[PDB]
Design a protein around this motif. Structure first.
Motif, PDB file in Angstrom:
ATOM      1  N   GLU A   1      63.537  68.553  34.388  1.00 35.27           N
ATOM      2  CA  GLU A   1      63.300  69.961  34.082  1.00 35.27           C
ATOM      3  C   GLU A   1      62.371  70.108  32.882  1.00 35.27           C
ATOM      4  O   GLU A   1      62.669  69.581  31.805  1.00 35.27           O
TER       5      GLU A   1
ATOM      6  N   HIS B   1      63.539  70.190  26.658  1.00 39.69           N
ATOM      7  CA  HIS B   1      64.560  70.077  27.684  1.00 39.69           C
ATOM      8  C   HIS B   1      65.940  70.360  27.104  1.00 39.69           C
ATOM      9  O   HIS B   1      66.376  69.680  26.178  1.00 39.69           O
ATOM     10  N   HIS B   2      66.611  71.369  27.648  1.00 39.39           N
ATOM     11  CA  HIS B   2      67.971  71.699  27.231  1.00 39.39           C
ATOM     12  C   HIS B   2      68.883  70.481  27.364  1.00 39.39           C
ATOM     13  O   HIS B   2      68.914  69.835  28.412  1.00 39.39           O
ATOM     14  N   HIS B   3      69.604  70.155  26.296  1.00 37.77           N
ATOM     15  CA  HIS B   3      70.515  69.011  26.319  1.00 37.77           C
ATOM     16  C   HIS B   3      71.742  69.331  27.163  1.00 37.77           C
ATOM     17  O   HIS B   3      72.432  68.434  27.644  1.00 37.77           O
ATOM     18  N   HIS B   4      72.004  70.620  27.327  1.00 34.98           N
ATOM     19  CA  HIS B   4      73.108  71.091  28.142  1.00 34.98           C
ATOM     20  C   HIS B   4      72.966  72.589  28.357  1.00 34.98           C
ATOM     21  O   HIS B   4      72.439  72.990  29.405  1.00 34.98           O
TER      22      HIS B   4
END
Length: 126
Positions: A56, A123-126
Motif C-alpha cells: 500500500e 505506509h500506515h503501520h496499522h
C-alpha cells in the motif's frame, strides 16, 4: 472496472495512475506500455492489484496507453515496442529494468525489490 469511464476506471487499480500527468515523483514509477485494445493488459492489471494489496502506497503504476501522443516519445524513451512493455523505475524515475512480456505478481514484486522502492515511507503501520 468497467463503470463511469470518466475518471473511475481504476476501480481495481490501486497505487496506479492514468498518465505521468497524474503521476508524481519520489515513489518509484512502473510504466507498462499497452495498446488501445490489449487483453494482456487486463491480466497484468489484476496481478498488479495483488501486488498493490501487499504494498500500500509505495510506488505508482502508470498505464501507458499508446492511445495518446505523450506515449509516443514515452514509448521510445523506455524501449517500448511490444505490449506490455513493463519498465521499472526507482524513486526519481531511474529506468533500471525493462521487460517486454507478461509476468506475475511475484516476479513484478521482486523487480520492485530490485529497484529499491525507497520512498513511499508513508505506509500506515496499522
Amino acid at each position: 472496472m468497467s463503470l463511469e469511464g470518466i475518471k473511475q476506471i481504476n476501480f481495481q487499480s490501486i497505487n496506479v495512475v492514468e498518465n505521468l500527468e497524474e503521476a508524481k515523483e519520489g515513489i518509484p514509477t512502473i510504466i507498462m506500455f499497452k495498446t488501445d485494445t490489449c487483453p494482456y493488459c487486463v491480466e497484468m492489471q489484476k496481478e498488479l492489484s495483488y501486488v498493490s494489496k501487499e504494498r500500500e502506497g509505495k510506488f505508482n503504476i502508470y498505464y501507458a496507453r499508446l492511445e495518446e501522443e505523450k506515449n509516443i516519445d514515452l514509448a521510445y524513451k523506455y524501449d517500448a515496442n511490444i505490449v506490455p512493455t513493463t519498465v521499472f523505475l526507482d524513486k526519481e524515475g531511474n529506468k533500471f529494468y525493462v521487460h517486454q512480456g507478461l509476468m506475475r505478481k511475484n516476479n513484478i514484486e521482486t523487480i520492485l525489490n530490485s529497484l529499491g522502492v525507497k520512498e513511499g515511507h508513508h505506509h500506515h503501520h496499522h
